[PDB]
From a paper:
However, we succeeded in obtaining a room-temperature crystal structure of MProM in complex with the reversible covalent inhibitor [name] at 1.75 Å resolution. MProM crystallizes in the monoclinic unit cell (space group I2) with one protomer present in the asymmetric unit. We modeled residues 1-303 in MProM-[name] structure, whereas the rest of the C-terminal residues are disordered and are not visible in the electron density map. [name] is covalently bonded to the sulfur of the catalytic Cys145 generating the hemithioacetal conjugate. Interestingly, the nucleophilic attack of the sulfur of Cys145 on the carbonyl carbon of [name] is not stereospecific and occurs from both sides of the carbonyl carbon such that the hemithioacetal hydroxyl group is observed in two alternate orientations. In addition, the phenyl tail of [name] occupies two alternate conformations. In both MProWT structures, Glu290 of protomer A makes strong 2.6–2.8 Å hydrogen bond interactions with Arg4 of protomer B through a salt bridge structure. Thus, because of the [name] mutation, three water molecules W2, W3, and W4 invade the dimer interface disrupting several hydrogen bonds between the protomers and contributing to the increase in the Kdimer. In MProM-[name] instead, apparently caused by the [name] mutation, the C-terminus flips in the opposite direction towards the helical domain so that Val303 side chain, the last residue visible in the electron density, is as close as 4 Å to Ser1 side chain of the same protomer. Room temperature crystal structure of MproM shows that [name] and [name] mutations destabilize the dimer by excluding all direct hydrogen bonding between the protomers in the vicinity of residue 290 and retaining one hydrogen bond near residue 298.
Author numbering:
A (entry chain A), B (entry chain A): 1 to 303
Write the structure that this text describes.
């Protein structure tokens, strides 16, 4: 038993990270087959990052302006193109460690693992949730751009995130691997604001089931409620409304514990109105929404 | 002069539309080079559309189950793969009418042209705006899926939308050309709800400039306001808050008319609080948010 925020093993991705330098700007790239993907602002100097015209910037470069290193080995760039906010560099060597992979775009509320890298070298791995306002709460310093987010299904790596920027509030924003931003952001060094964030209700319920499976039962009661009565309370506290599809997704957890979803909603309703009164759930004094129902099933189905 | 909702000329796209049939299900496909892109629910029967398992459905098909027609010519399918919610069919013939093209994902508030098609045959063309809740207000009947949305920049067609479904409220939802949905929808025939829609403020201001350029000036006054004072009124009426970037985007229109952006906001503030009192602007009795500042510049800069 036990319940921990955990990331996928990063081995398959570590073999794909390279260092990309253009001028005095260095960041990370993702090397799959004979292509290196990286944020397009690698072609910027500092004066350029306030209002870059990327099309002008790119036409003034040639292949030999791009320094790509895979550890010690230097990769020869033989072509380059821009695809939305990512640069695609054709190199002369296919990465022999290329895993089975796909490019997917995730939805708010879903989780993924981030492999933080600096200078082409993996540094740490952690799980993030895509927030309803299309930001993530990461840990990123200068030089981290081009670090990627991913999930592992079967033997296949699904890449879903590439890191580009930090917003003034300390949260992080980036693109999918086709170069399209999550959220209404642009890759310019100007002050941008994210929308209001909300709490992911289906995730909170999944985490309350995890708590019950691990022996934290103090917040349960015999009450029940209806979807409508719950959703009217939820929207007062900035919680996402709950759909019938969410109830269905929680099925396996309701079956394993014998506690119906609408019963758990009544417990959540009480915690929202009364608070937790110095009590904790799974070691937290706050309601956690960072775990999907699938994350919970993966750690709790064996209990 | 004059101001009309207009679509891009559709010629370059008309040459790319084909008919795709699998079983008794027929819809449209987009034929670029030697690939035909179409919604993956073409592989569904009716019993399948309530809860399809697309991976199971696809493994039970072979290339010869797919009938692709380009007018009279039958195209031979020699491979197939699934990419998120789109099917990619490799055919034996490259489309000789393939334009210069790219796949882009648009943001809420942006506009694009829809070429509505049935049985691989273009039927009509109209402009749409992507709503803040990731739906579009289209006109689509059975058989329209696989119709595409696009913009024309220079000589290049930017495809941004492929049509998949109608929601219970009569609005429409679909994917980008990589198969990733706009909004939190799935390609299942179940009741799904879109989020609350809001009014796109920068677009309304652009349209008020269009009105002034065309001689509709009755709503102007000498007042001015600040961004903060405006945004506090705007959020009471379900308008998107206005950013400094929006003010900058309106620059060319403020210059052409000599009316500062914050001056126009004061006029908008008054129309929101007082209404229009049976008066019209550009032939409408409502405030229109379907035109971007770039749409307005394109029709009004010559005036
Ligand atoms: C790329 O490595 C870098 C990642 C930033 C650095 C601090 N934390 C991050 O996530 N990105 C940028 O510097 C980015 C480049 C623009 C052309 C998009 N700008 C950015 O994030 O500016 C805000 C900021 C910069 C430095 C420290 C804190 C915030
Ligand atoms: C594809 O041609 C079709 C387009 C619909 C038909 C009515 N207007 C449209 O935009 N799509 C579907 O039938 C779609 C298929 C699922 C597997 C995603 N389901 C759908 O839109 O169901 C709602 C609906 C169906 C028929 C009429 C009105 C609404």
């Amino acid at each position: 038993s036990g319940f921990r925020k955990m990331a996928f093993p990063s081995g398959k991705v570590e073999g794909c990270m390279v260092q990309v330098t253009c001028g005095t700007t260095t960041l990370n790239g993702l090397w799959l087959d004979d292509v290196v993907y990286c944020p397009r602002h690698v072609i910027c100097t500092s004066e350029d990052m306030l209002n870059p015209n990327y099309e002008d910037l790119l036409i003034r470069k040639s292949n030999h302006n791009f320094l790509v290193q895979a550890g010690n080995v230097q990769l020869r760039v033989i072509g380059h193109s821009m695809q939305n906010c990512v640069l695609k560099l054709k190199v002369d060597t296919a990465n022999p460690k290329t895993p089975k992979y796909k490019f997917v775009r995730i939805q708010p509320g879903q989780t993924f693992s981030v492999l933080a890298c600096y200078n082409g070298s993996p540094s740490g791995v952690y799980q993030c949730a895509m927030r309803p306002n299309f930001t993530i709460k990461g840990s990123f310093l200068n030089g981290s751009c081009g670090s990627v987010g991913f999930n592992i299904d079967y033997d296949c790596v699904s890449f879903c995130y590439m890191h580009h920027m930090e917003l003034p509030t300390g949260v992080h924003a980036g693109t999918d691997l086709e170069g399209n931003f999550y959220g209404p952001f642009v890759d310019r060094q100007t002050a941008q604001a994210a929308g209001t964030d909300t709490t992911i209700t289906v995730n909170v319920l999944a985490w309350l089931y995890a708590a019950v499976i691990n022996g934290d039962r103090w917040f349960l009661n015999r009450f029940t409620t209806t979807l409508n009565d719950f959703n009217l309370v939820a929207m007062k506290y900035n919680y996402e409304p709950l759909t019938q599809d969410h109830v269905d997704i929680l099925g396996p957890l309701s079956a394993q514990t014998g506690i119906a979803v609408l019963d758990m909603c009544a417990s959540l309703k009480e915690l929202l109105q009364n608070g937790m009164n110095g009590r904790t759930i799974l070691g937290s004094a706050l309601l956690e929404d960072a775990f999907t129902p699938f994350d919970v099933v993966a750690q709790c189905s064996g209990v």
